[PDB]
Design a protein around this nucleic acid. Structure first.
Lengths: 169, 103, 224
RNA sequence: ACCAAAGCUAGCUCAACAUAAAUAAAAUAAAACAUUCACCUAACAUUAAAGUAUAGGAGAUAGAAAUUUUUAUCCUGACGCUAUAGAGAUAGUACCGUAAGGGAAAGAUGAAAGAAUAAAAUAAAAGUAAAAAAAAGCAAAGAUUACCCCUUCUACCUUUUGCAUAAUGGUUUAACCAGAAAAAAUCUAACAAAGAGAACUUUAGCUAGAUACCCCGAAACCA
């Protein structure tokens, strides 16, 4: 409809001078010069806020800081040495089956799952395992072999129930 | 590779004096100009105070070399300069039309 | 499915012939051309070509010394530090260009691709786009090209994209020699900047082939 | 019309390419200060690991490694700037200091002197041109005459609860001169369970663009 309306009328051939952005595309950057905000450039009257020497962030003004009054726990200790495992839903799998991806047993593997853009990249995860958390598994398609590091009980259950094969490495 | 030298008969293709022919008195490479005999007449003042007699004399003002062209000794027509080596084993400048040696 | 049918007029370019027929199906066409995308592509193309050679000297980079010109108090003059200060006429500027940079940026592939696509659509529907089977320039002289552009009533500025750059000397020699009106460029070197630079586009059959192949493969890669 | 402005050209910045010996500190940041401090002296390429593993008055801050990914020449200049800009430089001269050292200012007629061609002659300053009938004025406006008296009004700026204030800054004019950082977010577009040029994110996200945090000044310390 817009193609016919654009082709019907004869325009200026759209020279480079006729190029214009959509409304609200680029902001009209504010310049401190003017009588709008006088002489303080929005920094207010005096104080240390006016100066560029103003105090650093994370400072409560000399009173005991917030983070210093908080006890310690091993929450951060985990993110270092934790053994990484990624859960995968059976819904995603049956979705891959419904997307017309590779059917047969033999070629199926994690590599093929990588090529299908259905995998999560784990560059910062050392000793990466693969796990399956059950979901969307109701009346899912049958005769599909899956090879994973460690599969959950309900995953192996769901897969074997419909005739699938669970390969544990 | 230079164009005009002192003493040759030259022609002028541009200006009020265009079309006239004459020899060159002096060539200055500083301001890049030439002076043709009895051409571009201008006023000059040589006075005598003691004798009370002032004397105004006509003189030739320097003209741009780009408006001046050399004249071939044979063809006699104005022409551009070209650098060649004759059969006599010499480095010379000749007309772009004929083979007459300018030097 | 709406199929756009474009008529390709074959010109033997000798003279006095507008007659030719080829049925083309440019699926590359788009309903509404994006002005925003085109503008962003143009701005970007203008941006990565910036040399950013602008330079100055901050007060620290000034050859002048840092000695105090006089005592702080008792002199009767104003308080002053080194004479290389920006408040001094012998000093530089603090906010100046002196610190270098790079004005370019990385634009997503789909954006620039859709940019060239939309631009091609613009040139298409503007009637300024013509398709030919081949190109012939037997005489190979400026006068022939000029009188051809005047007789056939082409645009004021025509961008010719034909050759694969590997052949046909007779055309290129005359086309690339002293011509302001017409511009030359290989089929694999076709860009949006070149198209937007000219008011008229003329493509040949192989050029249209490779172009529609590249654009269909990029549209299919962007849709998937 | 007077002192005067206005008319050009040297000149350079930066990128790329070619080619007779011996652990330096401290000021400062942690709004004090004492352990501590990216940085600087010489060797130290890209992507990602990663602002992670750790270290630290476990305060400020400091901060890898294992490992990963990478690529052949040939193609030159300006969305850099002109006498207050760009180097200070028509020069390290003149000049200052015993010395080390510090460090300036400074050219324009015309194509040709062939010396009356030019074209404006308005910046602050005095000349052509002073106040003018017994009248008051932060310096004008409304009336009024082609001028004035009368009537109506407490300089600017800064700092402050509040300044015409006898609080601050300014002889005047010209010129120079002080808000350059995107994480999360709002917004404009690309695609969408995927985005993004082999790097990350992701129970509508992802990518790109566009939006907010200015200068001058010590007394002193160290080498």
């Amino acid at each position: 409809x817009x193609x016919x309306x654009x082709x019907x009328x004869x325009x200026x051939x759209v020279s480079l001078a006729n190029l214009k952005p959509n409304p609200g595309s680029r902001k009209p950057e504010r310049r401190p010069r003017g009588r709008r905000r006088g002489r303080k450039c929005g920094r207010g009257h005096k104080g240390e806020r006016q100066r560029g020497t103003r105090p650093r962030l994370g400072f409560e003004g000399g009173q005991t800081p917030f983070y210093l009054r908080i006890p310690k726990y091993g929450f951060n200790e985990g993110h270092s040495f934790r053994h990484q495992y990624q859960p995968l839903s059976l819904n995603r799998l049956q979705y891959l089956i419904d997307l017309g991806r590779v059917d047969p047993t033999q070629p199926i593997d994690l590599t093929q799952l990588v090529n299908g853009r259905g995998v999560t990249i784990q560059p910062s995860k050392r000793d990466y395992g693969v796990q399956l958390v059950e979901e969307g598994a109701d009346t899912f398609k049958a005769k599909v072999n899956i090879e994973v590091q460690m599969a959950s009980e309900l995953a192996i259950a769901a897969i074997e129930k419909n005739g699938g094969v669970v390969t544990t490495a | 590779d230079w164009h005009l030298f002192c003493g040759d008969k030259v022609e002028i293709l541009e200006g009020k004096d265009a079309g006239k022919q004459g020899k060159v008195v002096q060539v200055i490479r500083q301001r890049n100009w030439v002076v043709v005999e009895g051409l571009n007449t201008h006023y000059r003042y040589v006075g005598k105070t003691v004798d009370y007699r002032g004397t105004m004399i006509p003189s030739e003002a320097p003209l741009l070399h780009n408006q001046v062209k050399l004249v071939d000794p044979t063809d006699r027509k104005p022409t551009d300069v070209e650098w060649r080596f004759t059969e006599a084993g010499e480095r010379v400048r000749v007309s772009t039309r004929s083979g007459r040696i300018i030097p | 499915x709406x199929x756009x049918x474009x008529x390709x007029x074959x010109x033997x370019x000798x003279x006095x012939x507008x007659x030719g027929l080829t049925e083309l199906h440019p699926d590359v066409f788009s309903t509404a051309p994006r002005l925003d995308i085109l503008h962003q592509v143009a701005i970007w193309q203008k941006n990565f070509k910036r040399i950013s050679y602008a330079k100055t000297k901050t007060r620290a980079e000034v050859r002048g010394g840092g000695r105090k010109p006089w005592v702080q108090k008792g002199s009767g003059r104003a308080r002053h530090g080194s004479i290389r200060s920006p408040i001094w006429r012998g000093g530089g500027v603090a906010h100046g260009p002196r610190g270098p940079t790079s004005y370019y940026y990385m634009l997503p592939m789909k954006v620039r691709v859709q940019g060239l696509k939309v631009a091609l659509t613009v040139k298409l529907a503007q009637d300024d786009l013509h398709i030919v089977d081949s190109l012939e320039l037997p005489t190979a002289d400026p006068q022939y090209l000029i009188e051809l552009a005047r007789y056939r009533r082409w645009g004021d500025s025509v961008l010719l994209v034909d050759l694969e750059h590997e052949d046909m000397p007779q055309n290129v020699v005359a086309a690339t020699s002293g011509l302001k009106t017409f511009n030359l460029v290989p089929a694999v070197g076709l860009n949006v900047h070149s198209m937007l630079k000219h008011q008229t586009l003329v493509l040949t059959l192989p050029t249209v082939a490779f172009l529609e192949e590249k654009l269909x493969x990029x549209x299919x890669x962007x849709x998937x």
